[PDB]
Amino acid sequence: KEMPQPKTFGELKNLPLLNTDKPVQALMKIADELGEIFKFEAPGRVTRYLSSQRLIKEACDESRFDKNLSQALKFVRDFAGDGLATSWTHEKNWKKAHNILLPSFSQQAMKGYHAMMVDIAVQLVQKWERLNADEHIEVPEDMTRLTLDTIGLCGFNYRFNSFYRDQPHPFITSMVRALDEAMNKLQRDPAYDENKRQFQEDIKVMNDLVDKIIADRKASGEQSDDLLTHMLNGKDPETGEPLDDENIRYQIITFLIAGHETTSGLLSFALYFLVKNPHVLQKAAEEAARVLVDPVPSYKQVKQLKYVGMVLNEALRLWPTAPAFSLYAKEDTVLGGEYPLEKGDELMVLIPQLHRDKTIWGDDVEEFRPERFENPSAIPQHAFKPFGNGQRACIGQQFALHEATLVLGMMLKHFDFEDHTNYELDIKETLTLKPEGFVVKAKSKKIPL
Amino acid sequence: KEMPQPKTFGELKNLPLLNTDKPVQALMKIADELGEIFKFEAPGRVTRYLSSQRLIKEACDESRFDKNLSQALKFVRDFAGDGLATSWTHEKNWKKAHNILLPSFSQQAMKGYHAMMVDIAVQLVQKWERLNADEHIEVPEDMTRLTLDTIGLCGFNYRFNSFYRDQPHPFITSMVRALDEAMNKLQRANPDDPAYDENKRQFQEDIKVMNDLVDKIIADRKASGEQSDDLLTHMLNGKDPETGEPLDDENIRYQIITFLIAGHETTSGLLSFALYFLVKNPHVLQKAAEEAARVLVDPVPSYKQVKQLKYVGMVLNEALRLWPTAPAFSLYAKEDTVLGGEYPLEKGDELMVLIPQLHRDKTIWGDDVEEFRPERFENPSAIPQHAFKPFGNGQRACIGQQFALHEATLVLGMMLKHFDFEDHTNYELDIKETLTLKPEGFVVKAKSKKIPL
Ligand code: HEM
Numbered sequence: 064k065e066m067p068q069p070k071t072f073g074e075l076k077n078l079p080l081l082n083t084d085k086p087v088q089a090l091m092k093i094a095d096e097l098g099e100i101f102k103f104e105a106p107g108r109v110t111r112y113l114s115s116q117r118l119i120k121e122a123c124d125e126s127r128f129d130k131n132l133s134q135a136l137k138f139v140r141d142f143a144g145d146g147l148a149t150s151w152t153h154e155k156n157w158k159k160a161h162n163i164l165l166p167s168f169s170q171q172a173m174k175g176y177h178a179m180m181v182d183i184a185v186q187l188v189q190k191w192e193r194l195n196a197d198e199h200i201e202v203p204e205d206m207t208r209l210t211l212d213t214i215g216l217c218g219f220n221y222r223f224n225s226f227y228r229d230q231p232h233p234f235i236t237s238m239v240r241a242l243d244e245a246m247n248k249l250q251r252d253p254a255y256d257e258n259k260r261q262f263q264e265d266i267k268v269m270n271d272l273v274d275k276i277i278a279d280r281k282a283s284g285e286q287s288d289d290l291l292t293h294m295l296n297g298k299d300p301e302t303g304e305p306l307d308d309e310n311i312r313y314q315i316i317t318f319l320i321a322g323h324e325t326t327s328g329l330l331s332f333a334l335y336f337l338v339k340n341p342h343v344l345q346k347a348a349e350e351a352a353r354v355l356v357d358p359v360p361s362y363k364q365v366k367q368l369k370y371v372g373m374v375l376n377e378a379l380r381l382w383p384t385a386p387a388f389s390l391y392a393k394e395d396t397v398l399g400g401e402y403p404l405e406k407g408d409e410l411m412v413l414i415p416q417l418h419r420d421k422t423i424w425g426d427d428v429e430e431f432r433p434e435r436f437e438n439p440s441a442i443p444q445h446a447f448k449p450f451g452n453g454q455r456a457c458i459g460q461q462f463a464l465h466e467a468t469l470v471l472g473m474m475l476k477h478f479d480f481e482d483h484t485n486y487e488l489d490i491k492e493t494l495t496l497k498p499e500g501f502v503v504k505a506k507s508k509k510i511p512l
Numbered sequence: 513k514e515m516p517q518p519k520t521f522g523e524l525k526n527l528p529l530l531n532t533d534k535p536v537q538a539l540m541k542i543a544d545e546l547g548e549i550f551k552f553e554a555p556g557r558v559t560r561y562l563s564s565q566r567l568i569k570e571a572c573d574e575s576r577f578d579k580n581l582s583q584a585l586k587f588v589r590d591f592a593g594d595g596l597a598t599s600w601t602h603e604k605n606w607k608k609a610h611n612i613l614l615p616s617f618s619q620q621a622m623k624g625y626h627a628m629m630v631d632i633a634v635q636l637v638q639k640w641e642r643l644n645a646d647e648h649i650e651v652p653e654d655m656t657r658l659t660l661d662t663i664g665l666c667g668f669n670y671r672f673n674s675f676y677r678d679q680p681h682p683f684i685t686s687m688v689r690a691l692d693e694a695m696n697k698l699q700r701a702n703p704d705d706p707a708y709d710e711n712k713r714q715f716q717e718d719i720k721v722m723n724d725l726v727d728k729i730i731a732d733r734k735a736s737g738e739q740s741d742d743l744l745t746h747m748l749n750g751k752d753p754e755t756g757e758p759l760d761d762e763n764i765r766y767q768i769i770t771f772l773i774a775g776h777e778t779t780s781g782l783l784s785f786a787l788y789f790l791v792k793n794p795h796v797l798q799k800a801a802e803e804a805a806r807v808l809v810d811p812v813p814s815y816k817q818v819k820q821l822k823y824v825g826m827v828l829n830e831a832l833r834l835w836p837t838a839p840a841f842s843l844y845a846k847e848d849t850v851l852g853g854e855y856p857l858e859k860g861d862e863l864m865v866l867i868p869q870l871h872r873d874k875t876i877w878g879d880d881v882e883e884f885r886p887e888r889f890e891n892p893s894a895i896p897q898h899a900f901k902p903f904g905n906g907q908r909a910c911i912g913q914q915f916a917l918h919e920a921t922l923v924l925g926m927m928l929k930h931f932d933f934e935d936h937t938n939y940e941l942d943i944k945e946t947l948t949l950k951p952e953g954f955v956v957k958a959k960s961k962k963i964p965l
């Protein structure tokens with residue numbers, strides 16, 4: 064009945080607890096101490112962090128709870144606009160873009176994106192093939208190069224050419240700097256005036272380039288296999304309307320934001336867990352060699368990388384790279400028979416804690432065992448939520464998993480990996496999670512492309 | 513361009529291929545060999561069987577194709593009349609009954625039918641609670657008892673009382689024998705033979721039995737002025753907004769017979785296939801049983817609680833994917849058209865949509881099409897357009913879909929709440945075929961969880 068709450072700071076309540084550089088991991092430690100639910104109070108804000116499958120399965124009841132914009136999402140909305148990720152379910156542009164974009168994110172739609180994904184994946188393989196001896200790989204850096212270029216090419220036929228660069232494309236510099244400002248706002252004022260002005264400059268950089276590419280595509284009339292063509296030609300079946308040019312811009316910015324570093328973190332965490340578990344790596348490398356019998360992987364071959372898919376799912380279990388989402392109660396309701404909630408009350412789903420619920424996974428929750436996902440019906444309802452819930456779930460799930468399965472499979476086919484530094488896991492936190500400083504050496508198997 | 517075709521029998525062309533007791537399953541095997549489309553020729557009949565989402569999505573374009581009466585539907589029309597299921601789209605009584613009946617089949621209308629559905633569902637639960645040890649359940653038999661009584665009660669406030677009987681109500685005996693004669697006619701190479709003269713006389717006798725009882729109940733209700741929460745009251749009081757007309761007494765009779773035909777064994781087969789798949793996949797059963805116990809917290813389920821049985825709904829949809837109990841429907845080309853960029857069709861040319869094959873299209877569902885995984889339906893947004901058609905297409909889709917799904921969700925949830933199930937014979941799936949599909953001889957044991965009603 065009475066809900067636990069972590070330590071307070073007078074008038075600031077729990078807010079100073081977020082003024083730390085690893086807030087998700089700090090919230091996980093609080094969940095370890097306080098349990099499946101604790102109240103988090105701040106000036107003008109009350110929310111509740113859920114950590115158990117028992118309560119989260121009720122929170123995922125769409126008749127009782129809808130997606131809420133967290134403070135992070137509200138700050139991201141300042142440059143993601145009413146794109147899919149930062150719009151409310153009741154906003155006209157959400158259901159519109161949802162209906163329009165759903166067919167182009169289907170498993171069937173990945174057949175059309177596969178050739179472009181392979182283009183970038185080959186560039187990653189060739190970079191590592193061309194490294195000199197005793198040089199090493201900066202894993203999250205290269206994974207981010209790959210995912211950024213993949214979404215640029217599949218999103219609107221634009222080549223960031225990240226593998227030709229030390230300093231990222233100017234759009235990426237502004238996007239990354241905007242996301243950093245969004246998170247820093249969470250942890251904060253006269254001194255922040257230059258940050259605020261800088262925020263507007265980065266917003267202008269993103270809008271200008273995306274608007275230009277849309278105008279360029281409209282001026283050309285060319286049809287590509289990218290999401291931009293689908294949005295310029297698609298019509299919402301419900302209202303009969305197409306997305307306007309401003310919303311198309313926000314959707315493109317959204318795909319870059321929501322997709323690039325979540326997916327690059329997944330690949331980085333997956334490789335980290337593989338090199339720390341050599342038996343799992345060997346099993347995944349065995350499948351990659353048996354399945355990828357051609358110089359270039361096909362769409363059908365990527366679907367055959369079953370164990371690689373389980374590896375990615377287990378990496379998402381331990382460290383989901385979009386580590387939380389927010390919900391609000393549509394009406395007065397009681398959560399788990401003992402926590403009354405009023406209409407509008409907010410919830411936070413702490414995904415990494417959910418995925419460590421020993422009542423679901425057993426005692427070995429910290430062990431990396433892809434075999435947990437061998438049979439998907441053995442997993443209880445709402446126990447595994449790395450991509451959100453319901454109609455507000457990740458629209459790019461199939462995109463992210465297809466790219467990550469293709470790239471990891473190619474990595475495992477072409478290289479053996481060495482954890483040459485005995486890397487100590489250090490998780491840097493932005494709005495997403497990544498293993499900072501993770502490095503490996505790759506010895507080529509000398510298999511041609 | 514050139515269309516495949518199965519083996520022929522001289523002058524009879526492909527027709528003898530249907531003279532088998534599992535024709536849908538035989539047509540699926542032909543689809544496995546020949547692909548997404550094959551021509552089927554008979555004396556005086558040519559049709560084409562579609563199996564791929566690629567072609568079926570075009571056949572479902574209502575601007576190009578309209579519902580055709582299959583030969584099965586034409587034979588059912590001899591006792592279903594111009595009811596909704598056996599009338600052409602251009603017949604005045606279709607759009608009339610469609611406009612009148614659509615509001616009474618909506619999800620909002622299920623709130624009014626819920627109490628009557630619970631009545632029969634409790635009778636089923638009570639029957640199984642009262643079984644002795646090591647006695648067993650005949651699953652399709654009991655599911656048919658439930659669906660027949662539910663549509664009887666919700667349709668026109670009549671109790672067949674099937675759970676008080678070994679031999680069904682005389683109306684049910686005549687209806688089943690009429691449906692059996694309809695299917696047997698499909699498989700007769702010499703239908704005008706003198707031997708089937710007793711079949712023809714019996715067929716007319718069964719037609720008379722059905723009309724007499726339904727006409728009597730309509731007259732009985734009109735003479736009393738009683739108002740119930742059934743479809744018969746809605747049809748006696750409803751007026752088509754378009755023409756301003758109500759349904760006449762003859763059409764109301766045909767609609768009532770239609771609800772019984774189109775609804776009873778399609779729905780009972782779904783429940784039977786669902787329970788079969790649950791006992792063969794214990795992980796799915798546990799997941800569905802957990803939801804039933806958590807959601808159905810009252811002795812009697814409410815309408816709102818049934819809507820919360822999401823995973824039970826996923827189980828039913830996956831059961832409908834593998835074995836849709838109304839396994840085909842027919843279409844005709846409104847004008848000359850080209851199907852799939854290679855199959856030129858002329859005005860009036862007929863198509864058959866082989867639904868179980870559509871639901872096994874690996875280009876849509878992946879390689880694991882034969883596996884029972886309700887998780888495919890966890891997010892309904894993952895299913896492409898026209899890939900999943902257990903209830904038909906467009907304005908000629910199943911009007912009773914919400915009814916069927918509410919009934920099935922309620923009953924399966926109550927079954928999972930009150931009993932553990934054992935596949936005590938390791939039942940080997942054997943699908944008996946009439947105009948619908950059912951797992952013949954499927955039996956289970958139920959051990960009660962001792963939860964009162
Ligand atoms: C491993 C990689 C990814 C993970 C873990 C992930 C995670 C998530 C999560 C948890 C949500 C729900 C957020 C909420 O409820 O507030 C979400 C939504 C979303 N994601 Fe992803 N995502 C990934 C990749 C991608 C990619 C590649 C794209 C685009 C190509 C994308 C686009 C979106 C969009 C548009 C939404 C909002 C959908 C809607 O609300 O209608 N994500 N994602």
Ligand code: HEM
Binds near residue numbers: 776841901902908915
């Ligand atoms: C799981 C159960 C059911 C399934 C799979 C099913 C399937 C179908 C299919 C495939 C059609 C289209 C037939 C065609 O196009 O020729 C149809 C039509 C129809 N069904 Fe159902 N049905 C079910 C339950 C019911 C129930 C419970 C009722 C009545 C209460 C019902 C009444 C009708 C009617 C009236 C039509 C014709 C609608 C029209 O054409 O206007 N069905 N059904």
